[PDB]
Design a protein around this nucleic acid. Structure first.
Ligand SMILES: NC1=C(F)CN([C@@H]2CS[C@H](COP(=O)(O)OP(=O)(O)O)O2)C(=O)N1
Ligand SMILES: [Ca+2]
Ligand SMILES: [Ca+2]
Ligand SMILES: [Ca+2]
Length: 341
DNA sequence: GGCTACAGGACTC
DNA sequence: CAGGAGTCCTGTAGCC
């Protein structure tokens, strides 16, 4: 199989630049302002000029400003980046009907039937990059390999504005040398346990006792790493269909007062319903982020669709459940809808 | 034993 | 000082 993975560079910031070319060359930081106070909130992303200096996704807006006080700080305009993203995905569909849109800025293309080898795959890579640059003036990174995992690792290595092919031999080389932290799906918590059992590389997972790996990181993750280490990983590229839609908001003040949480819960329901579009959920979860940033939730599935009105009343019952089963205060409240008709 | 629902864990962008 | 959205897996308990 040949997989070509496309990853939009510094997407949100790059779209802001395309819309305001005066930003070009400057550090740009796209932020999610929470409302709690001047500059409360976090960074969604930043362009390379800002990232060079340590301004990256997830840090507090306040910390970024200590580092880069004169950078351009912009509020997130996701609906704008979604429309640009949709247009680029349409361009990629021209190059393969087997396409997996993984997120607003990543897509996998199975081009097994379009090219014979990596040479033609690379050339198809340039063709796509040039097409996108020409139509939308967005630069992207193309990673090419035998499966989704290594096509992505490839783009991780080549970004920004790059294109890289990892052939069969480098797969083998990476299985030996690639740090197992850099493997998609392995985060600090897992990485600590792997580079706890001396597992620093995919290969190490083959020599260790299975029940032992599974004991630490669970069955699915151990099979996954092991299949990758055996160079036997295959996950088909398939149409991703949205499984859930929701919204969660930050309250101006922490609370556990039902009447004071309601307005937030209700606005979260309103936005969610809008985004549901013509989808009818049968399940609803109320999600609370507590004062210490722990995530709590209670949900219900129905044997029929949930009307907005039923969403409102059930959401309050589920929120009561949370309130009466946990003595902490809430900081963020929301809902998530799923199991669509 | 293993399927189902539900709640939490971890991860990704 | 810690936003938001969305996915997959797992432990526990009910049930066949
Ligand atoms: N924590 C966090 C992220 F890591 C990423 N992020 C959004 C989701 S999509 C957009 C992609 O930005 P990027 O292209 O700057 O990310 P990169 O692909 O370089 O890792 O970033 C976001 O909103 N929050
Ligand atoms: Ca990405
Ligand atoms: Ca990207
Ligand atoms: Ca990692």
């Amino acid at each position: 199989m040949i997989v070509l993975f496309v990853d939009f560079d510094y997407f949100y910031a790059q779209v802001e630049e395309v819309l305001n070319p005066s930003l070009k060359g400057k550090p740009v930081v796209v932020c999610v302002f929470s409302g709690r106070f001047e500059d409360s909130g976090a960074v969604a992303t930043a362009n390379y000029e800002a990232r060079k200096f340590g301004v990256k996704a997830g840090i507090p807006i306040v910390e970024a400003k200590k580092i880069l006080p004169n950078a351009v700080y912009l509020p997130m305009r996701k609906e704008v980046y979604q429309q640009v993203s949709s247009r680029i995905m349409n361009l990629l569909r021209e190059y393969s009907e087997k396409i997996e849109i993984a997120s607003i800025d990543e897509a996998y293309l199975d081009i097994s039937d379009k090219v014979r080898d990596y040479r033609e795959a690379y050339n198809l890579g340039l063709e796509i990059k040039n097409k996108i640059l020409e139509k939308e003036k967005i630069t992207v990174t193309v990673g090419i390999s035998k499966n989704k995992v290594f096509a992505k690792i490839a783009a991780d290595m080549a970004k920004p504005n790059g294109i890289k092919v990892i052939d069969d031999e480098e797969v083998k080389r990476l299985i030996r040398e690639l740090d197992i932290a850099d493997v998609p799906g392995i985060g600090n918590i897992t990485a600590e346990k792997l580079k706890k059992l001396g597992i620093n590389k995919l290969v190490d997972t083959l020599s260790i006792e299975f029940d032992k790996l599974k004991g630490m990181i669970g069955e699915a993750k151990a099979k996954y790493l092991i299949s990758l280490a055996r160079d036997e990983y295959n996950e088909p590229i398939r149409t991703r269909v949205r499984k859930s839609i929701g919204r969660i908001v930050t309250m101006k003040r922490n609370s556990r007062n039902l009447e004071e949480i309601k307005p937030y819960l209700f606005r979260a329901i309103e936005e969610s319903y809008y985004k549901l579009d013509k989808r009818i959920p049968k399940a609803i979860h109320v999600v609370a982020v507590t004062e210490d940033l722990d995530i709590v939730s209670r949900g219900r599935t129905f044997p029929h669709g949930i009307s907005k009105e039923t969403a409102y009343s059930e959401s309050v019952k589920l929120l009561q459940k949370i309130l009466e089963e946990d003595e902490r205060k809430i900081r963020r409240i929301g809902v998530r809808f799923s199991k669509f008709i």
